[PDB]
DNA sequence: ATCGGATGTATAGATCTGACACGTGCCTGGAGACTAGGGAGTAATCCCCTTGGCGGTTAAAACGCGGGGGACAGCGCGTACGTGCGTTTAAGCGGTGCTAGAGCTGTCTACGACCAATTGAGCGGCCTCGGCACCGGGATTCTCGAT
DNA sequence: ATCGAGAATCCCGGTGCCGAGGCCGCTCAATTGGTCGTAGACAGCTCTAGCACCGCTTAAACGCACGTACGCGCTGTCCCCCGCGTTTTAACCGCCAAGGGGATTACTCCCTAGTCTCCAGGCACGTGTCAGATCTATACATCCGAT
């Protein structure tokens, strides 16, 4: 019997066995169901893809082919939902979103 | 060591204010900023040192600082 | 001679220091202050360079957010300059 | 000692999202910290959900409710749809 | 013909509601509002009386704290009357 | 249309307990909006907890857990 | 025979040990951890109750109500810090007035 | 299951001539549960961080130093070790 | 400043009453004894990464000097918001039925923990080049003195 | 509303370099395949509390007038912060060296999970009763209009 990874059986790219192992040895519950690692890996993959889409768009807007922490910070702070998700998070070497109050602008 | 809080110079506080989007700064802002930074630093470093002692280590690692920040609700990304 | 009016050079600094992501605080004074503060809790402490880097990043992010709230309070007071009382109100509302 | 990380997995996702875009080591470490933070958040909320209902296991229903609690708005709807699709495809082999 | 100077009776009732520990909002309107809000999430939904009471306690506590922050922002702008801009500033600084 | 049930005197009483001396006329609408947002945020989580428990009534513990979730821990109900 | 009496405490060491086991906190729990945690809980409870009883006496009452607990928590510098994000039901609020609003 | 009898026993130790209402008793139970869960969660994270699998008095001590404010922590640790000191001897 | 009158709390004193503290039965969760095994204490070792020192460049900080523009005080207008009285309304309260559903009980089947092979995905170390940084040079743009 | 000079920033071009990426070897953790025990899925029952209804009482909300005091705009003043030039000064980078302690492994022993037996601590359950909520009368703290 050829070994077929659970991620391939679920169509995911994140590991299902690793997430299952972390759930089992994370002291979360006495038992862990079969579909919980699949669901959690799918959710984590979705969130990762969602951030990487906007980060790549921001990198392309700066004529850059690589993603740096500035692009991740711009992507997260420009999207309302991601900014709400990570409102209490500091990103190393991310800077701040360029916002100047209208009062401070020249008369 | 003696009075290294003066190492957070007035130009540095001005640059931090500029990044925050502040146009004009009073003269008393610098001392208040030094005090607030000092209080925040002691609050974080106390927890970092507590984590270091609990590990029976004499070195304050970056992961200790990350845990101390997460304990206060900061959740620094990057390091570790 | 040519002298820019007081409004504009401050605005150029705002744009310059918002576009970039450097530290803006010198490494050695901040590290020395960190070790000074840590002397109170444990003598002869060793610091990992990544730990000092993380401390600097977190401290500067906190100060930038505090300055944003301070500028908001100053504008709410129908003002442009920030004063200690602005920082005090910002910290009072934030819960510190 | 061999250290584990989500670097290869994030890299695979990046090659199917932006096929010709790279990522720096600092940004990859930030993404690993993101994945770890969300994993711990969702798993802790699922553990609390299992404890509240006197349950001894964490199923896909607990993870679903944890996602609908942590994630805001439309992000939660899409994450729930993706998770349900993955679990259905897994149960259909 | 006895009339109090404006502000005297307003400084009164402040001490009264600092000292008292009642709910300050009628129970039935709040319960109807809770049910109307909840029907958007799940229809034919029941509520325990203690659940509505807990919701009410949380609502009054949050609103009272918000009004204290609003007052702080109002005096910050050299004022006594609170305007909705003070509420907006307090909510923005609080992170809400 | 029960948001009007939060009357003007009720908001005045809340402001009085908050130490507010004078209230502008537009405060009463902003307060209702803020209260509606807060109640929506709390009740969403409360209903989520109720649905997960396969129940049709919102118990007080659901509201307690929802409030503890948002950082607004409440003592007195369990 | 009771572990709480053996440790000179009033909170139940055995119940705290059981709750530590059931809570999924760790795979194993040390013998002295429930004793330590019960002692900490007893000290904190005693502090709250002492300050609340003082508030009740200052209000000329011989019974503690949630108002007295709220007064005790908010009037202490460190207990207010510990319970900053905590709402006491029917606890009220600390009576204060901004000095500028006074005539 | 609650801490009502223990809170009442402590109240008679500190205030022998005062009582407590039922709602204040419930608030005290909520306070005890909240503090218990906070300290136990921090102890579990301390055990996880250092690759240990046992929660000991050292983890509870570190969690108390982390959660409680300064002076209020100093007495609490002073209490806790004392109990262990009494518990170990007998 | 100072007095008097008229409100709105203090203060004392009965008067019920219903939560609160005190007994009772019991039962189930804690205590005591004893065993197995593995988690953690303890020793020893390696190397890395932390600390201390030194020297040279130079970017940044400190200091001093215009000068204008912004904070702040002072006035006046007018309007919005308190205070209060009369009127309306619906909340509060007290009873009643009624039944939806929350909680508890008793099978029983499926599902997750557990253990022994088995091997392929993922990590460590190694070239390897190209994406981004650095340095000139020119064009374009922004600001401010001027009309 | 325009013109023009001076300073700032952006883009095009050339050059360099070191960090992301592909790749190979090698593990050890994920996979497969079985069993076993128990967790919760589900049908059944109970009983309780959530919901609906209705009449009465009256406390609270709403509306309308009126005065006033506070928000807001305007104007003058002065002082203090910003821009700029010049002179320290120590941050920074590169190199070198010593060693403390942070990771590792090996061994062992004792501390905790687990089980059985037994008992009493605490939780329903009931009940007397006084701490306090309410009411009513007297007393005086306070506020506001003349004087």
Residue numbers in the entry:
A (entry chain C): 12 to 118
B (entry chain F): 22 to 101
C (entry chain E), E (entry chain A): 38 to 133
D (entry chain D): 32 to 124
F (entry chain B): 24 to 101
G (entry chain G): 15 to 117
H (entry chain H): 35 to 124
Can you quote the paper on this entry?
To position the 8-oxoG into the catalytic active site, OGG1 binding induces significant structural changes in the nucleosomal DNA during 8-oxoG recognition. These structural changes include a 1 bp register shift in the nucleosomal DNA, significant minor groove widening at SHL − 6, and nucleosomal DNA bending around SHL − 5.5 to SHL − 6.5 when compared to 8-oxoG-NCP − 6.
BER can be initiated by OGG1, a glycosylase that recognizes 8-oxoG across from cytidine (C) and excises the adducted base leaving an AP-site that is subsequently processed by downstream enzymes in the BER pathway.
